[PDB]
Design a protein around this ligand. Structure first.
Ligand SMILES: [Cl-]
Ligand SMILES: [Cl-]
Ligand SMILES: [Cl-]
Lengths: 242, 240, 242, 240, 240, 242
């Protein structure tokens, strides 16, 4: 028909449905584990690349610090490039300094105790890295060295192996690591999303209501508190030139 | 999903099209934006999957006698051997000689829309096409006899119930000469094509409609080979 | 000859002449109203995309707010993406939040009383939208919520239907809407440009002297006063997830 | 401007070229930058409008015997069947076998510049081109006889008054063997071409000079068909 | 470096490949990332220098009977006349009919890796390829007889000492039927190819190994001409 | 083998070796002086484009100021576009305002007294230009006009004509211009890098230890002190519209 009545709710439905279908497709179409993971990870990266403010980059990467320690391979890194160099780039493959990182996520097909623990380990391999911070020159003078921002960590999946999907067994698994490996938020595209409440010191699960869109908004809102990354001391990395 | 499946690949190709056409229709509550969204989905399918000898875009078509077509939502045309007549950023005018196929893309099939599509197809087929002898590695071919331009209609839905039944068949039989549609797709229901042997339209229900249409188009395009060789000096008569 | 004497004035002449010719071409070559408008609008967008500082995006878009209200289709939106998400993106089509908007313009072929009023209505459909504003975390602490910036509005044309082109009838039309629909500035590529003087509370017309370049500089200078958009409350949009 | 017009489309195509070449000349008051600006306008015209079987770029040309050309402002060449000999970011060296046409692009025609262009064209035509039997769907063609390489000059203005008169004609008749120019364009005035039937140069005044030249080039290129099939192992003799 | 040199251009082409493959191996201390880095170097060489009639990418291959290959590091295939079977962002599945050549790219040659490559090549050659009569400007060709699919191995180093000696020769003679390798490159040492006349493998030492391999590949590909014309309706049997 | 032990030192080695080889290739392969220079200059530009924070642009350009004066052609300009327009852009050719410039470099094949003096002249042609600076609106109010930042100047080469490469004759040449033409830093890819020490008011040479990487880090660290360019007064350029 010729009726036209704009709906904001429909936009958020369509945003989520696109993610859910493409993740379902990646799982069903690719019967090779490498291709299936690459396909799914790309769906999440495209969502962040499309919708996050441009102050954020989103890509697969290794993280490195000025002590010469490296993270594991991170499926989805959210990081700064406005104020931060790459440490190494070779064609499309990138290694980013720890000081550039805002958030790190593991992306897999279905939530489980083993996957949650694996994600907790990936996140810990980033949070253990050392980050420098120098006083920051700006138009109004020089700020003190910014105190180190929290790196957000999380888990992104299509499905859940538990029944109910987002129940006590998921909660138990999340409480397995409340320090270096703590997962601040995550999304189960077929069911809902979760986040850690700092005030109550507990995990909250939110069911349905456009899970991928709700996760995206939660990520944007939480990132706002981080402001910009602290200012990197590239000469700390330069000790390794000799 | 135990193992690789061609059926699954073709289902996923179609489901992507069906869902994005539905998103275009639901999300964009403005007639211009809704049309642009839906047309872009169909163009993207053609751009991704057609052999690279084919271009797919929105364009006007014009001939060397100064006859212009209406704006065509989805033109399939040659660029390997054919110039543009005019390009201004994203707006293109292509010579009639370059055209392989023309489609109208809309939300839902109806008697008015089938007729509209037939008229659009006829407007392109009525344009004059030059054809020169063709130099090639082995010598010079005689001028290629003119290829038929394929025509069709692409929609998300059908206004009829049943969607792809006798009323649709009646509309398609409304133009059996230079507006005749060769094929088309209703993403939510099936596809149709003209069967030249039986001189009748056939409908195929379900069975991955967008992918079925894509394959029908590729197979039929093969018979056209490459476009005839344009006489650009026929257009050059308008320089003076 | 082999003479070389750089001229800054010539650069600004060439910048304007390019715009004037391409707008004239769009009008003459495309005898289909949709194609003609798309061609012309693209000329103005390319000028802004080429020359504006990269903190500004310029594109055709719909604007939406956290109350679920939508603007009309805006030919030329100038908006933030460094700090602002898209609300929806589908291939090249975008819907931006009201909080991201710096300026909105209507682009048409020739200035007239009807076109000025139409542009005033387009601008009003944006200014009526609600914009959130949160306290802003930064390297030096937290700023108060930034007071809402003015959205600049305007009209971009190739020609004028009036004789003289930029005379009292144009002035009358501009004074038709001095609130939600007020046009702050605009350009008539073949004749000159206009702007509203806040101190004198009157419209000023400037004839010739590279109209498109003069408009571009006026826009850059006025945008500088706006600083960056206020910080969006994406959770205000998230009320529509349920 | 009541209705669509091919004449208007061709006028707008030309006016865009003429104005941007004038901008390049006026705005960039540095000889390197001015040349780069003007050359890029001509390359953009060719890139936009030539059939995609043609590439257009600045390049050096080299043959399998180690003979190198000078740097050529505008080379029209094949990539569908031809490798690069060397590419380093934006700098390319193409095999002689890939070349369809070579142009010098400068600000204003003059006796010195016509001669310069003739010399550049001869330097490419003097390079050796291999040609092997060509496998194709129907079998194997004999080696294609070598295609003539087209040569020309592209400018914004003319130093002469009249712009395209007897002095220009005298300069063009200065090289009637391997430096002979086939065609060229003076954007502000007209275009020229060698008429093989009359064995004389012809000038066409006004009537959308850049577009007229574009069409002349497309029509003449058609006679060349595709480049001969390169013997890359002739170049491979230099591996040892 | 007094003057232009084809030998130098070919040395620089090779040195770029050799150094970047060594960088991939040294710098990326993770097996997935190391492989991705090295594979991308070889793909970039092919993308830059092969004629544009060839695509080069990582892909799965599938046929119209539902037989799927393993993931192939470097597939050389047609897109001018061939659709994708499936594309999802960067992941592609190509029809067997589109394939010209298949390579495995790894760090260092070894008996296990030569065997692995032979198996990968056989898996693609065992897939069924359709071939239809081909419409063209002059009429219709008979269906093109199936082209041989070229196979090979690309590495940076060799595990053997000598690098390209009898042990390598023994490994290559391990598969002389549908897994037989046609050619390959060891960037640090040389290249190899199967000599059909002598029915033996030949090794070429030094003399710009990557460039020598590139030229060998281009020359051999020429004999294949273009892929046969796919019957997409054979794939369409899986729509139901 | 299957061993995996990440090394930060190796990344910096590979970064430098890539530059050294590609510069060596440009010199050896292209026996035409224009092509050879274009090839080499492109190597340095790609390094800066790849690794510098995205607040910096790196390209070949002419610089112009609001008095209508122009620099010479600058091989490698590092400049702002986040807050700065182009003055003119024609296809890929750009003219940038002086207010946008952070650093300027000359790139040539081999260091020599003549090349150092030529580079000093290029740098001086930029530093002599006039730069405006306006009070800066931001989320916290209005900063005073930022005091003009130093423009960094330098020389980038593959080789040195002197033996030793980085010896007293290089030092003498560098001390030829300690004002408008002073070279703050530079790189000789085959040998080392140099920088001016402000405290000691002398030039320092550092040999080997990944020269291009050491130069890159020195540039990043020094640029940090400059903060963002001052805010341009585009209306100063607008005086040339009439
Ligand atoms: Cl009609
Ligand atoms: Cl010569
Ligand atoms: Cl097998």
């Amino acid at each position: 028909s010729n009726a036209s009545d704009w709906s904001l709710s429909q936009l958020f439905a369509s945003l989520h449905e696109d993610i859910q279908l493409r993740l379902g497709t990646a799982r069903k179409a690719f019967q090779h584990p490498g291709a299936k993971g690459d396909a799914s990870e790309g769906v999440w990266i495209e969502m962040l690349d499309t919708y996050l403010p441009k102050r954020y980059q989103a890509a697969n990467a290794f993280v490195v610090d000025s002590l010469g320690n490296f993270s594991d391979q991170i499926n989805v890194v959210v990081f700064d490039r406005q104020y931060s160099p790459f440490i190494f780039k070779f064609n499309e493959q990138i290694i980013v300094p720890a000081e550039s990182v805002y958030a790190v996520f593991e992306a897999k097909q279905s939530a489980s105790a083993d996957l949650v623990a694996y994600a907790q380990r990936k996140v810990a391999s980033v949070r253990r890295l050392h980050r420098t911070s120098l006083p920051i020159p700006h138009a109004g003078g020089t700020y003190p060295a910014k105190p180190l921002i929290p790196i957000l960590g999380g888990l992104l999946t299509f499905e859940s192996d538990w029944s109910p999907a987002l129940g006590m067994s998921f909660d138990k698994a999340l409480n397995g690591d409340l320090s270096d490996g703590r997962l601040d938020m995550g999304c189960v595209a077929s069911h809902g999303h979760f986040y850690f409440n700092n005030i109550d010191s507990k995990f909250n699960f939110e069911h349905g209501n456009k899970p991928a869109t709700a996760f995206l908004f939660r990520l944007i809102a939480q990132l706002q508190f981080s402001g910009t990354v602290p200012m990197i001391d590239i000469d700390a990395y330069g000790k390794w030139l000799a």
